[PDB]
Amino acid sequence: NECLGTIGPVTPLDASDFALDIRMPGVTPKESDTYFCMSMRLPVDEEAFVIDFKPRASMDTVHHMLLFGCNMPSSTGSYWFCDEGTCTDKANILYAWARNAPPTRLPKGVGFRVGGETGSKYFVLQVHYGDISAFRDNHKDCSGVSVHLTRVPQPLIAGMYLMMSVDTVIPPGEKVVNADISCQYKMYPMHVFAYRVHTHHLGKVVSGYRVRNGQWTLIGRQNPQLPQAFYPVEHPVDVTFGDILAARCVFTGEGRTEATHIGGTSSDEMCNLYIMYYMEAKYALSFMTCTKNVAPDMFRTIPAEANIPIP
Ligand SMILES: [Cu+2]
Ligand SMILES: [Cu+2]
């Protein structure tokens, strides 16, 4: 180990379980706001279940950490600048740690599945370093996360419903601009227990709803400029066949000089809502996406709370 840690990358914990220690290789952030990434292949090829996490952040410097599963990490080197990519394939978020917005534990009996036919072969870890002290550009850092994996089949499988907005432009100086996303849901029940929101600097607030016969149930609402942890859903919201998932990101064009495209162009703005759910294992899938607004009509009736600043 690069920071003198004696823990191996795998530690068997009893007959069916093991821990993976996923730790940066002695990296030295030389600048403030640096995103380093690394990858860790699953040691088993059979499917396995991620049931628990323990963060190992340098509290001096580490702002947030994210952990993804995927099959095509963006590099095969010991580490890399995450601005290069996370994975060149889809990157399925498993965990977020933020310094001033502490993670919530997985519900009991809930586990993400990895490996096997359908599951991620690799973890990719992102460690974002905030403002760093001068006089630290020979300090080696091994921040990351310890993952509890089991090969015991879990009764509930966690996954991610990803809502993204790609059809909306922000005109310069326009005070408030909404980006609405909506998709009909057509699987077996999922039950949303957490969420995380992401825009860049123009995002004001992001809110997620289940709409069922024209009644809206909040999934969750957060300002994207607060720490983008997974915020817990106090009472898990069941979403079933026939519901619509609806989301609204509120943006500002204030202070801008040209129009800002939200989504693709991989340019300037985006709006992503990470809806973390579990499904009864036999009906489960690990992820779903919504990238459209099938029912723009609906937003005329949106609850007024969806529009309230969270400054
Ligand atoms: Cu951060
Ligand atoms: Cu982004």
State the DSSP string of 29-69: --SSSEEEEEEEE-S-SS-EEEEEEEEE--TTTEEEEEEEE
Q: Give me ligand 2 centre to Cα 272, in Å.
A: 8
Q: Is 282 helix (H, G, I), strand (E, B) or coil?
A: helix
Residues 250/304, Cβ–Cβ less than 8 Å: no
Resolution given for this structure, in angstroms: 2.2
Within 10 Å of residue 30's Cβ, how many Cβ atoms? 11
The tokens describing 21, both together, are 């220690």
* 200 annotated binding-site participant: yes
Chain breaks in the chain (C to N over 2.5 A) after: none
**Partners of residue 215 on adjacent β-strands:** 212
Of residues 72, 139, 187, 200, which has the active-site annotation? 200
Q: Give me ligand 1 centre to Cα 33, in Å.
A: 8
Domains in the chain, please, with CATH?
1-158 (2.60.120.310), 159-309 (2.60.120.230)
The tokens describing 3, both together, are 């920071």
Q: Is 83 helix (H, G, I), strand (E, B) or coil?
A: helix
Closest of 94, 74, 79, 77 to residue 141, by C-alpha: 79
Rounded to whole angstroms, the Cα distance separating 74 from 276 reads 24
Residues 41/147, Cβ–Cβ less than 8 Å: no
Tell which phi-psi region holds residue 303, choosing left (phi > 0), alpha (psi between -120 and 50) or beta: beta
Q: Is 200 helix (H, G, I), strand (E, B) or coil?
A: coil
Of residues 38, 128, 164, 288, which has the active-site annotation? 128
Looking at 78-226, which runs of residues are DSSP E strands?
Answer: 80-81, 92-98, 110-114, 122-129, 144-150, 156-164, 168-170, 177-184, 190-198, 203-212, 215-222
Of residues 40, 270, 276, 279, which has the active-site annotation? 270
Which amino acid, 275?
Answer: I
Rounded to whole angstroms, the Cα distance separating 133 from 140 reads 13
**Partners of residue 48 on adjacent β-strands:** 114
What is the Cα gyration radius of the chain? Answer: 20
Rounded to whole angstroms, the Cα distance separating 132 from 277 reads 35
Rounded to whole angstroms, the Cα distance separating 243 from 247 reads 13
Residues 210/237, Cβ–Cβ less than 8 Å: yes
Closest of 295, 290, 292, 286 to residue 162, by C-alpha: 290
* 235 annotated binding-site participant: no
The tokens describing 44, both together, are 């088993």
Q: Is residue 270 among the annotated active site residues? A: yes
Give the DSSP H/E element, type plus range, for residue 248: strand 244-251
